[model samples]
Target: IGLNAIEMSYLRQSLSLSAAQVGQLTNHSEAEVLAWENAETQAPELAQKKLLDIDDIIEMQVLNTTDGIEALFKKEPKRHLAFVVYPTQAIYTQYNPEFLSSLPLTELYNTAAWRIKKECKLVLEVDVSLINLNVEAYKAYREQNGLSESRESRAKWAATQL
Candidate 1:
């Protein structure tokens, strides 16, 4: 039967079992029994307990069976963070062209319109009309570089506004 060294030793001492009796009960050699009493052998698995029907034997045997005693206990099924969805405010869509390109047609149109409005305000307030502001500056750059006007490019520019 399954028994730790302390339990076996206590049983042997209390029952005053001879070596032959201990061997018969435990299926261990006298040397093995001595080794167990001396804390040389470890405890047997739970399955081994099927052979023994001693009452409160486990509780009496183990001095410390609390969670803290069972060789560094760790809680199972630890929780962890899953996917995180950054809030709409966390959207720095204005700075990234690739992000803008992926936008829907409606969003792209709204972005371009907003940029145009801002450009108009800058041009009206500033004396330097040559310096194309905001959306105009982006369009001028694209035109100067001979790049085709695409919705993706406009959307990216809008996203860069922060």
Candidate 2:
């Protein structure tokens, strides 16, 4: 598997290693390391493995930062919130044609919302308790305001009810 060029460059720069230095570590010629650094050649198998380890380290550094985690939340706040708020949207759409048909945008909404949650869980390593709390709060709000009708009507009614 060929590593991405951008990732290769990032690792080299972050480690403050010259092509010669990396080459010495991997037992390759400086020319070969330079080629890999520039993405001019597929890295040798051993070099490829080293690059993957570096990528994992970079990911861990990002995941450890408050700003990095917040950036994920900022990427799509509404979609993430919807995933928590209407956790059953996917199931309801599968079983209830009326509910699904009422919201022409449900397909698009559901797909994006599902992906947001999936990526957050898998990539960001966010705590499940945070997600659960938001979901519970949203559920309470929906019930208190009687926004329990079809997705379309509830949106409209909720707007005017506000």
Candidate 3:
């Protein structure tokens, strides 16, 4: 399917990657990147690759938030609880040692998606969206509580509430 310009732009910025850089990482040309960024083509591989990149960034962002990391302990959490148990390093290393070394973040995300599908019984799209929600909620909670951004502090606070 054609890529979403907005989403592509967000990924480009979040990853601090230029279009040429992303294209090089994904084995696409600069022209292809421009087309994808402009919604000018339907390349399944490219679209999925970009989405994986975006998701990886979101995952890292959420991991730093209280709601994202703490939701793992809820008895009936709406989010993907397996995020806590996801063997990201192990799986990536098993699948491709290079991935653990210098692989692009998107490739790392692709491995994560595969691992989650096999282990978490999670539908990637739905589960990923749940993570996005957790990130938003965490940001709102921080603002309301006047909390500073500290994953350790948030985790401690969250543990107390549990």
Candidate 4:
């Protein structure tokens, strides 16, 4: 529903880091990392951005888009599968968890599904845990200053990852 525990565990193992190491690198607490692993806490922007960078380095390329972000991976015989990220509001209303988890699976799935149905491409509906409009006070600060509204969505479809 929130963070994929399997994925996060694989990532930690693949990176050869413990929970504390991952937390330090991502500017989150080890508890936070564990929460993310368990879908208890929403993966914040900094952590998400760090994860994206790590994905790029590992050739994973977790697709972070305005519509949604997704994780794409390939195995030996199975077809490539996707895991999408949704908004918090959507998630809260849908699953009705005790605590507010990360992105909503519904919104992310809807966005990704729409893309998949229209594009007919193997797209994983996920979210850019980084460039959020509500959280990360600095983002609102930047918006107030008119710095930029985080063109991550545009860049996702752009020619380059940079």
lDDT (tens digit, per residue) of candidate 1 on 18-133: 54555555576777667767789763543124224232332332222222222322443212111111123223254334433333122232333333334434532211111112
Q: Write model 3 residue lDDT over 4-89, tens digit each, in one string.
A: 76667666655556777777767788788778678787445655575575566546544443343344435445443322111344
Q: Which tens-of-lDDT digit does each residue in 1-162 have in candidate 2?
A: 566666666665555556775676568898988777777987777886764554454444334433444675677543222222233545545434643432322332343334444555676555322121133444566787776645543333333322
Residue 109 of model 4, lDDT score: 34
Better of 1 and 3 by lDDT: 3
| Residue pairs whose backbone atoms clash in candidate 3 | none
Please list the residue runs of candidate 2 whose C-alpha ends up more than 4 Å from where it truly belongs after superposition. Answer: 54-162
Q: Could you tally the backbone clashes for each prediction?
A: 5, 0, 0, 7
Worst 10 residues of 2 by lDDT: 78-87
How well does candidate 1 match the true structure in TM-score terms? Answer: 0.26
Superposition error at 58 for model 2 (Å): 8.1
TM-score of each: 0.26, 0.32, 0.35, 0.32
Decreasing TM-score order of the candidates:
3, 4, 2, 1
Q: Give the alpha carbon lDDT tens digit for every residue of 50-124 in model 4.
A: 655554533322233312322222223222223223346553354334222322223323433344433324443
Using TM-score as the measure, name the better of candidate 1 and candidate 3: 3
Which residue pairs of candidate 4 clash? 68-126, 69-126, 69-127, 84-125, 85-126, 86-104, 87-104
